[PDB]
């Protein structure tokens, strides 16, 4: 920060004495259920070497976590969201570049747990007849224990360049009713895989053994809300203060199949069976500070 | 944030120099119990691209938590909520639009141990008679620990539109009397679901065997109060400067069931039995800047 | 929060340029033991769709935990708190509106542990005699663990209309000289309740047999200080610009008896015995900008 | 707080403004080795309907934990501090009222853990002989686990009228050379009570066997330093502007009794053996808002 | 704090629009190796009934850990310090008091485990000559634990008056080499007390056999720096303006010695046998607010 | 603090309404491999008795872990960094005292923990035969538990006069490949000191069984800054307004041999084997509120 290198603080931040030009898009895509919203701000400081476009994305993808197939009574389908992205492009011919972006990926930290212990231990024994006994013994133990946190989706930023950046949240594992946790390629000789599996040998037809969405994570069906910041840069004497920007909402659907075994409920996985995609074309002009779509 | 983002802090954020036109409309609708409060706030900031009005829906949704019926003295009945709701929304033809909302949806976490002990132990025995042994052992052990929060209650943001929104808090699970904890699912072979049941096989009446609602989450007698905000954005130069917006408090009613059994008691729990509906419209005048009933 | 929605931090918050009237009122009923005291508010922004009145109940309730009854030296009874309450009403003719309240009901956590150990373990064993045996064993674990905080009282958002508001702060349960925790319910087939029990066999006689207050919740004998707001919201074009209202203190008391069963004591608990209620009523005059009794 | 229910911090609090007039009183009393002080604030706000004179008690008491008694070398007695009081309190005549006091009682707070653990082991045994044997077990463990903190001291505040308040600190138990806790009803049949008693059957005279005062709470020797805060309140319009009110500082020293029975120490306490008052008047003039002796 | 009666924060504290005259007086006394700093503030609030002048006492006194006799190689002999003590006096006939003191005593807190664990077990024996046994046990446990922080040195405000203040910082215990932790009354009959003995029968020189003062509390080598502060009243009218205070510092040394016994090393320690006192007469001047030596 | 003696916070500090004089002296010292950095500060407030100079010493000095001497591949010798310093000094003919300075030695904590625990069990045995065996037994544990903290570095400041004062960061001990913690006076009669050992009996040149330094600290291969501050004051009329101050920097290093022992290696440690010191010279002029080499 600025106070480690003996400087006030905000001293070297953008921003000040400036009129910041925001304004909001919004738009509802139906057909993939994804609420997109744009909130932007132009930032023009005097003291600033370029023009910046604050761009957050935000809204909702909703999860959709359905049962989708039911072949019969022994065989059915759950389609569930595995993944949700969000991307911004700019086209090869602008001027304009990716400056900066938020969040970024964190450095995870594990704790680490030695122990050694060390006893002796005696005792003397008898009985009725008189026989006197004894026993001296002693041990060592030496553990190691490892501790670190697990969220159920994994936030992160992917490689970007100076016109593209995007982030996905990708599912990492889940509890399913105190038991697990379980990932997309857990695997297990009897039930394979239990991700969504209500009951291991419920007498029930398949569409009717899969999780209560209630007892999952609320993004899997209620759906993931993106806040997602972009800073574009723009020279002040550029010929053209014209640029087209691209954002793409996504998500990754799986397909966790069901079927009887004749004595127990048997769970597959298949990985990115559907990729909804919404992509949105926005204009900005950097003359009046305004984005349109 | 800002400050991420080498930006100075709050100067991104709406409503600097700006009169926010704020105001209150209580109603109580005594048939549903519910306490129905709506604070809301027009931002008109001349450095934003739209009119925005903050509706925040709070008051208190009635628990109700209450025996309902006493079919002699071996059975009897007992409603609780298990769902809370709110939900706003924007008729087809309007041209305002849903732009924020709050709370979202987060992403649940757990902390995961591992642990790999060894150990050597020895004792040397011996006795009056003369007889000495020995014994040498050794030892090896693997554990896993899963650790994480459980609410009570779950507060899920509805999958939203541009023209409605919602929020649901939902019954997740309860200890009763350090036992448990108990969902709506709990089964056991021979007591049933557990959830509200006061003892075992108590002799008393099925009406004094349910636990009594101060030793319970005080949602489910006393309530629940909403705090909920939205956002809704509306163009500045538009012909039709009024919207029409619904708000709704919503409450499901579980029904949970004790009889005797000749032995013991037996509780069964049946979902969503009832629903209690209280819908309001509301008139937005975005030229005087009023909320109105 | 208003950052969560883009919003400068207290962009609509009511109260600014705004010159508020406040106000104390203070009594104390002798009969009761009760110190009540109003601090109320006016509020009259400009900004703002309605007049506010934020009433803050505040003052002492007196505990009384106390021996009332020694019938000779086998017998005696204690009168105790169990509940402490406040409410504040208006009459149903007065147009004024209770519109907020603080503090509500909050939704209870717990923190839930799943381990699942397993282990290996082998012995080799040696005589004098030349006998050489060994022993191999394995052995798995599975253990579940709940935790959660318990308060002594829990304060309790009693389901408000809009012309009246009340909270309860309500006996939980209570450690008895690190015991327990006991409760209002407990039952032991010896010993009956051991609330506030303080040996379970003594020479003394019943009077001297109770717990003393200083190892008891201070709430128990010093009292309990309430800290409750109320808003109520009030038309600026009424006709009648005077408004009363009830506030009222209550005290409800539990009568634990200990009684010698010629071989240890018994102890028995009584619900809701006596009630103590002190009620007052003042005036609005929102004109003035002043409240009386 | 304000921003729970919309209003900007500090909105409705005292003292926007407004001059206030300070002050200090100190006094020493030798006899009672009592430190007094008063620091006193009058604040004349406008927009408040009464006077108010924030009165702060401080200063010090000593504890004076002392050997007071030497009957011989097997017998000794020790005075030591078991509470603390302040007191303020307004003649029955006055005008002006008590209105606000702190601290107050809070509501404890424990946290509760239950866990249930089961688990299966086998074994196969074996020797030279020839002789193979197998063993199968099964076991089932519940515990609970109770969790609270307890200072040495407890702050009570006693219950106040308009006319009176007090404070108590009284102590609650301490550690005693890692043993204990031991508060003033610690009994042992063989010991009596230890609470200081330095060794259990050294061969000193009684007069040494007595806890160093620097392995015991600082309290109980170097004293406690009041910090407590009274809010009198005052008609603005009222014919007499003068108000007597007393404040009195009290100390209660209990008597430690330390005999040799020829084998061991024996401790015995006797509570309440000595009190000690430090009463002082004081005249406010609400006129001239000054504070005299 | 103001906020708990309705006050807004720092309306009672005293220099608003004041000019304060602080200054600086720094000694060095290299006999007694203690490095005395003053840094006094002259308030003169015109809104307070007197002048304050507030005396923060600062610096190190160095701690003096070292070897100070060496008896041949079987005895040797090490100064330590056990206490460090500042001291401020007014000599009686002054008319200034002592008004305010900080840090002062805190009351200590500990946390408090109860645990009840009750299992049963059961295991079946088979063996090869068609034997079959079974075995079912059952136990119970009951537990204590009790944690609390120790600090190495205890910050002590002696009984204050209002002529004299005094704190101590007094040694409390310490860990030898992860051993412990030892204080100056730890005796064991073999090596009696092991505070700073590096070996218990290393064949070295006595002098050689202390515990390094890098692996010691940092406060017996180089020094502990006070930072405590004083309040001074004064009368405005007040014919005298000049006052004098005497600034103790102070410095107890205890005497640790080792010898030999022909098979290990034996440590004792003797209180209190060197005391180092350096005092400072300062002049205050209040028409002037200037302090001088 | 200024809060906890009814003072507005900040009111006695000193640097209010003035012109600070800022500077920085930075020079690298190739030999010892030290950057070294000067800021300082004159402070010269008028209501202060004196003139201020804040110097802060940084900057880096290299911790040169390396690898030093190869003798054939049985011996080999690292030199590494146990001591870092940083000295200032006045001439003892300036009239400029040192006043204060940061950070100072502070007092260390550790955490006790006490447990009692007592058990009973019992079992009944039969087997095909039809004796019916019975045991009861009871058990009794005492524990004790000791945590505290160990940084890998202790920095300590060394007791100060009003001409000069230090600061030293020491190596305390360090976590070898989740071993230990070693320091420099570990010893194992089998491999000696084990601090930078790689592998006890890996067969490899004896200067590639050193610790990697990215295992170890960084502060033993990249180096250590310090942030030290320290205040001088300076009279205002006094003769000559000239100071010279000296500054130095220090590494003392250590000497870790491996040798192999035809069976295992073998590490020993040398103390305060090299020590590079790095002086400079500084002149402060007060009129000109500079400070130059």
């Known amino acids: 920060a600025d106070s480690d290198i003996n400087i006030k603080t905000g001293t070297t931040d ?5 009129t910041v030009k925001t304004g909001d898009l919004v738009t ?21 070497n370029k023009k910046l476009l604050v761009i957050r994305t935000k809204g909702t993808i909703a999860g959709q ?44 930290t ?51 360049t100076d016109k593209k950046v995007g982030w996905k949240v990708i599912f990492n594992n889940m509890v399913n009713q105190n038991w697990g946790p379980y990932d997309r390629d857990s695997w297990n000789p009897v039930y394979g895989n239990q991700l969504f599996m209500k009951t291991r040998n419920g007498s029930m037809k398949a569409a009717d053994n ?17 806040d997602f ?33 004749s004595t127990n409920w048997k769970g597959t996985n298949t990985k990115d069976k559907w990729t909804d995609r919404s992509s949105e074309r926005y204009k900005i002009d950097w003359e009046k500070e305004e984005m349109t779509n």
Chains 1, 2, 3, 4, 5, 6 share one sequence.
Not at 14 to 18: A, E, L, P, Q, V
Not at 28 to 48: L, R
Not at 77 to 84: D, K, Y
Not at 213 to 226: I, M, R, T, Y
């Open 229 to 261: 910041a972009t800073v574009i840069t723009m020279d002040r004497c550029a010929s053209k203060q014209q640029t087209n920007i691209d954002v793409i909402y996504e998500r990754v659907r799986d397909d966790y199949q069901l079927h009887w075994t």
């Open 28 to 48: 509802y895509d139906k057909e993939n259920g994804m609420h997109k919203k744009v909130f932007y701000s132009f930032i023009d400081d005097k003291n600033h």
């Open 110 to 160: 594990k704790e680490y747990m030695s122990t050694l212990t060390y006893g002796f231990n005696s005792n003397v024994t008898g009985d009725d007849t008189g026989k006197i006994g004894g026993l001296i013994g002693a041990n060592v133990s030496i553990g190691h224990t490892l501790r670190y946190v697990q969220p159920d989706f994994k936030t992160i930023l992917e490689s970007p």
């Open 65 to 108: 976590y359905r049962v989708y197939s039911e072949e019969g009574a022994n065989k059915s389908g759950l389609a569930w969201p595995s993944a949700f992205k969000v991307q911004l492009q700019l086209p090869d011919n602008e001027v304009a570049q990716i400056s900066d972006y938020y969040p970024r990926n964190s450095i995870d």
């Open 210 to 226: 899969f999780l209560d969405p209630n007892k999952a994570s609320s993004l899997l069906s209620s759906g993931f809300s993106p």
């Open 14 to 18: 953008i921003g000040s004495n400036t």
